[PDB]
């Protein structure tokens, strides 16, 4: 039937057809993470009593800890929660390095500027987010905390580089006047305060912004989600999750001379060849389960419906009438101590035919 479907026919001619594959399945999953003893110090980032003006935005490094992102995501307190390069749902199971939380206070109409490729006074002069960015921009209204102070850069010689924090406040020439200092006419002080008041409209209400910048799947992980490890099962097809890396295959001990600073190995296709286990620093190889490849030897259907099946690159130890040949394992055919003219070719000197009780 598989042959009939690939050929779009209810009648099959004599010969060999190539169909399906041999796809051995994983039977269980495996999860392995480094054993991290700390919970991440984020109270300081999100629930802080003071935020920087954007102009002099703060940057906090997060490391050697567990972070449950379910809580921030599910919380309804945020006005915005926009992730780039990652789904908030998936974020919880990923492991990272060099995680940073940038933070500052902005006016509500500036929310649109904290984005990878937007322009404006913040995006260009106070806080530039890279066009190439992985991470989440999370923010909420702080009118009840900040309104009664904060200064923003309006006059700058050039646009900022991503993640640049330039805080010189020197008064300088804008126009034709050859001066610095001497504010007035065409020389100006670079910043303006935008005090926040309870009477400000929403575009002028303060917002507390936290930007979480991540380096995903750097070989090490220091910041890792709340996921439990399982036992490591060897010599079976499994799913995998080595410090955030996934795939399917059979894992075995590997006699490889990894250097002390190495923890992954790669193939010519730049796919994972090997990993160093996160808890026991053993080198393990990952080999895909099986490909097979199957062709079906068919007498024409106007004669009979018996078929023989050839598994192209297998041993007759894996998968009555089983013949091992150079071309694969031929199952259902009866090998004989004879020779004849070739009819349906198989390969490597072997052919097959339908003959007599046929």
């Amino acid at each position: 039937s598989e042959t009939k479907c690939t050929l779009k026919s209810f009648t099959v001619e004599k010969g060999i057809y190539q169909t399906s594959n041999f796809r051995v399945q994983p039977t269980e999953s495996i999860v392995r993470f480094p054993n991290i003893t700390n919970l991440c110090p984020f109270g300081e980032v999100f629930n802080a009593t003071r935020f920087a003006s954007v102009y002099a935005w703060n940057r906090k490094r997060i490391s050697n800890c567990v972070a449950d992102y379910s809580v921030l995501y599910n919380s309804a307190s945020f006005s915005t929660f926009k992730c780039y390069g990652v789904s908030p749902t998936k974020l919880n199971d990923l492991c990272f390095t060099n995680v940073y939380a940038d933070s500052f206070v902005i006016r509500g109409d500036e929310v649109r500027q904290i984005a990878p490729g937007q322009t404006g006074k913040i995006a260009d002069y106070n806080y530039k987010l890279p066009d190439d960015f992985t991470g989440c921009v999370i923010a909420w209204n702080s009118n009840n905390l900040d309104s009664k102070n904060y200064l923003y850069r309006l006059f700058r010689k050039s646009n900022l580089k991503p993640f640049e924090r330039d805080i010189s406040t020197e008064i300088y020439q804008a126009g034709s006047t050859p001066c610095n200092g001497v504010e007035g006419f065409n020389c100006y002080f670079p910043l303006q305060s935008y005090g926040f008041q309870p009477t400000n409209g929403v575009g002028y209400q303060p917002y507390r912004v936290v930007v979480l910048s991540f380096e995903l799947l750097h070989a090490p992980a220091t910041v890792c989600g709340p996921k439990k490890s399982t036992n490591l099962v060897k010599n079976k097809c499994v799913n995998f999750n080595f410090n955030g890396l996934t795939g399917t295959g059979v894992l075995t001990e590997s006699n490889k001379k990894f250097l002390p600073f190495q923890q992954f190995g790669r193939d010519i296709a730049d796919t994972t060849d090997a990993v160093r286990d996160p808890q026991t620093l053993e080198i393990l190889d990952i080999t895909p389960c099986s490909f097979g490849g199957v062709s079906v030897i068919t007498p024409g259907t106007n004669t009979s419906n018996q078929v023989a099946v050839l598994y192209q690159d297998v041993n007759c130890t894996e998968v009555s009438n089983v013949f091992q040949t150079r071309a694969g394992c031929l199952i259902g055919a009866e090998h004989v101590n004879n020779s004849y003219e070739c009819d349906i070719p198989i390969g490597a000197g072997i052919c097959a035919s339908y003959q007599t009780s046929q």
Partner: antibody, heavy 116, light 107 residues
């Protein structure tokens, strides 16, 4: 949102143990840390020890290093503290307190008096 | 460890007066992990100030404070009779907690 609910008061005989139960209402049993604090009558507060239910890690005050075992039940969102080899010296109010990651507030239970 | 010491150990003040309680650390601490509590006999400690600032939800708003390094203060702008209480500072180091000294306030 967060509420800590503790078990009632108990009277012990010398040498026995007391197991104080603290239920975490409001959720976030995991991804938070729970500590136990004691207040002997006429005294201020002192730390006994604590646990991180998600990481399965315990930590104790040197004063209480040994005697007390702290555990956590994820399924029932409940933390426990069992203090053995009790003496009249241990008459105190035993408090449960916790903090969520991502937060700054420390939430408290009611305090349970245990006499010996 | 880091030991917190408060001062004065005891004090008698009148309602209507401004009052302050100090808290000194033997080692510098992050302001973000310091907190002040109020206690009345028979009651669980009540949080007033956290992160060495940040007035707690439901607070009377007569209380405020600040500090850094090794030196922190709790200020009551005007004492009301209800503010005469045991007060203490604590450090939530998360791996280490520090408690002690109630600077007991009486009329």
């Amino acid at each position: 949102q967060v509420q800590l609910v503790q078990s009632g008061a108990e009277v012990k005989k010398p040498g026995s143990s007391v197991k104080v139960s603290c239920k975490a209402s409001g959720g976030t049993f995991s991804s938070s840390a729970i500590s136990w604090v004691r207040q002997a009558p006429g005294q201020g507060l002192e730390w006994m020890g604590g646990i991180i239910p998600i990481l399965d890690i315990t930590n104790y005050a040197q004063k209480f290093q040994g005697r007390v075992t702290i555990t956590a039940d994820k399924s029932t969102s409940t933390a426990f503290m069992e203090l053995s080899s009790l003496r009249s010296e241990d008459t105190a109010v035993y408090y449960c307190a916790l903090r969520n990651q991502w937060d700054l507030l420390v939430y408290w239970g009611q305090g349970t008096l245990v006499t010996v | 460890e880091i030991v917190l010491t408060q001062s004065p150990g005891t004090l008698s003040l009148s309602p209507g007066e401004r009052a302050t309680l100090s808290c000194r650390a033997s080692q510098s601490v992050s302001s973000s992990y310091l907190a002040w509590y109020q206690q009345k006999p028979g009651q669980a400690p009540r949080l007033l100030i956290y992160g060495a600032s940040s007035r707690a939800t439901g607070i009377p708003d007569r209380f405020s404070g600040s500090g850094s390094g090794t030196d922190f203060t709790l200020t009551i702008s005007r004492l009301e009779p209800e503010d005469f209480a045991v007060y203490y500072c604590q450090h939530y180091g998360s791996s280490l907690w520090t408690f002690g000294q109630g600077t007991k306030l009486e009329i």
